[PDB]
Design a protein around this nucleic acid. Sequence first.
RNA 1: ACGAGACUCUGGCAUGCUAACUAGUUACGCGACCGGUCGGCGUAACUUCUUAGAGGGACAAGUGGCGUU
Lengths: 189, 65, 132, 62, 314, 138
Amino acid sequence: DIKLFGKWSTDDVQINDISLQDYIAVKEKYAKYLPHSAGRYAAKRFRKAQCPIVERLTNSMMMHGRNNGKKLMTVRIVKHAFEIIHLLTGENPLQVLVNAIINSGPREDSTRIGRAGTVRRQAVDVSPLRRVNQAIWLLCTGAREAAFRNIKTIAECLADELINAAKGSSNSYAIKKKDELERVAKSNR
Amino acid sequence: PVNYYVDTAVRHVLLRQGVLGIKVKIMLPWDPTGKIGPKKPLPDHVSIVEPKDEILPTTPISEQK
Amino acid sequence: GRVRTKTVKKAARVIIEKYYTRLGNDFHTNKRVCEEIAIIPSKKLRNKIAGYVTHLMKRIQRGPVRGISIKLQEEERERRDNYVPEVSALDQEIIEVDPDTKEMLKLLDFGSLSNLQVTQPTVGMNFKTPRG
Amino acid sequence: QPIKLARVTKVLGRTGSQGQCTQVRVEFMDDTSRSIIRNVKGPVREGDVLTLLESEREARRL
Amino acid sequence: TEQMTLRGTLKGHNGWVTQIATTPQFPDMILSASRDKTIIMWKLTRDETNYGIPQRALRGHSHFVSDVVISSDGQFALSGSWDGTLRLWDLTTGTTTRRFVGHTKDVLSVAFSSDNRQIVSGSRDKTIKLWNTLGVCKYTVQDESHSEWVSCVRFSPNSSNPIIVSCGWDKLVKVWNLANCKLKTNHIGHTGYLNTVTVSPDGSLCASGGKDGQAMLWDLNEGKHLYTLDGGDIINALCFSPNRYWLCAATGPSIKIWDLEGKIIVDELKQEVISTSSKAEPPQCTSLAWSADGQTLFAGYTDNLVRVWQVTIG
Amino acid sequence: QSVQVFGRKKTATAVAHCKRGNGLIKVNGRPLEMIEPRTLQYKLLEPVLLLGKERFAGVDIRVRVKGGGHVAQIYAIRQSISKALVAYYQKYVDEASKKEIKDILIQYDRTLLVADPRRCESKKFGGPGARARYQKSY
RNA sequence: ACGAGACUCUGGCAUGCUAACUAGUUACGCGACCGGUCGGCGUAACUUCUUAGAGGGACAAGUGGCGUU
């Protein structure tokens, strides 16, 4: 009975990725009314995995200078586009967001050469936490530059971005970037 | 402690070829009440009281007064 | 970094060596003891000294410490070191002896010893580590 | 080749030009008896699961 | 014949249980003092889930609470604390009725006279003070007192010859006459500092213990040493059984009961499940209090639990 | 029967006077569902939503709040209300009810009962703020 | 031995102490509106809120691992 905003439950959300189950916090101790909790999750390493995923998205929305610190605006932008994901798909918006997080996180990518090197790149595996972080960052960036210089409002660009990422469609900026990174890692194997 | 354990003075001396600068710093001794120096000890100085020599009672003696 | 400075450590060592009887495993009693028996002009320094005294009390609880030297503790330590087995390890019914030391004992005039058992000597003269 | 998971059993060290990769030991979730060393890029801790798309290379020791 | 077994454990303290107080007026009421700056008034349900639950929490001390004692009627409580002050609490409302100021150091012990007309406070100030119930200090034994901390002060339950017995960290047991508050008797013989003294319910014996581990019994009327029982650790507390001729000592992490007749160990109360976590020291018994009827003994420990033992015969 | 237990966040501080009553909750004379941002209304309703109207039914709570910022006055009001109910239950009901309400509140959010110690850091010369520095050129 | 640390100032905690018409809060009276809202008026309680003094409080102290243990 701790539905988000006041409408979205969490009891039905299934992560079903095993790898990211411990790093997406949505279900029972992480069911909160609002994606705004002050919180001190940056004080110690790995704690941000205890932060609810909706609050992580909300924090990632405050970007590009003019929107720094405006968290009430971002919680409004999440409340909308949850109201819109529900209308477009008919599913729980939390489930759509979780599926988007699963689909948009890279599994491999390239670093500078192995132990050492200054010429090419070497493929490596991605931590689950870095997977979730990169997924949130890519989803937010795709929404941000879909809404820029366009009559389409934010909370519409973000809703469609999350829906496409949940579907796995290539109309999503996050899915395109994930595929690009994974392919480059493949080439540098 | 530099603000109450060392007393500093700077002075000029007008000589034929120019000015000589003199600086004098004195580190005062610890003075308990008597003004030769500061009353407070240095903050890093720990003094441990020497334990008095006691004799462990071999047998229970009761003293009535 | 919680590394204690030499001020704290030497103060704690002296306090322990002088007042070992009054101290224990309790930080909050140890700090009162320190503030009663010593003159520490700061509360934080007193707390650091008491904490290290507690740590060292725990350390001496399970043996000795290279810094401390308690006069009364050494008596009990040598009392533990005074262990004596029932039968001396040097009292053996039969002791093996090589032919060479048997000949040496015979030359000593002690060839009449009975406990000696003349064991067989080694065969191969291979007692050196190979070079390379 | 299929995609398969592996649980981290111990963090070996830090590698890379700028120390950006954690070289780690992983045991496979299904087999549970075969283990390898791989470099993982990001913050890693005990017991988390890495999905390997390729699953038979070995990271170079140290 | 008569053995004691563990019946229950009382939870609710966040710090070491430093004193347990019972009264012969409310058999379902217990006061426990603790290092969490709080005194818990329990309610003895004696049900299956728990022996007792916290009913009220007396707060107002700014440091550890070292001793708590209940009046003759279960309506008032007296507490001493490391904040240097003493507090007289009304047990119905749970608020401090009176505050006793005057000690410059930690207050280690406190006692209420039988008539509940006098109060004795012994402090780390090496000082024993007398108070009325109105919070006024009458006498202060600054001289001819302990040269070290005063660890425990106790009244004598004898209507005749009013004596107060005190112990200090100077390894001395001092007996003072309540009439004039001068040193009547001085007792030597302890090797280490003393923690507690217990006065017999009839006022005939006084037991003392501490670091040395030896529980020494002294005659109170005649003033001489009687018998030194051997404890295997530091004696944190002592108490006589109200009815049986027993003495119980909180010896380290255990408690031992001796029959004062046979002068032999009657029981060894030790409760600790030993496992791979044995690398840490077991919790130490700190306080001991017998029930009004005498069939129950409450023990405080470092793990902030109060364990109740019952004489299960058997 | 009253407690007056208060709570803080940053510079904002709110004092909640909780007395024996019939379930009134006001903040600065206004009812609870009228505080300003109204995006964090659920942040104000968290105590009563977690504990239920039955537990507040025997008390009237009046909160006076002053200090810095809308989002700090919120979190100060909710801390004050939670701590006021806890203290009233402790002083006037029993320890068991206090234990259960404290357990619920602490399990949901520690900041509902224990104040956040974070405060603004000072500015040092050579930069626009606490740790930022002015641009360096060569 | 100097430097580092210690130190001083400062930030957080105290329903414990000291005490306030140049700070208040409760309570009670008198008023204004529809029990409620009164930076409306006035005077008892008192110190939670405000001030600022003294003291307390944290020490890697407790537990589990890693370490020459």
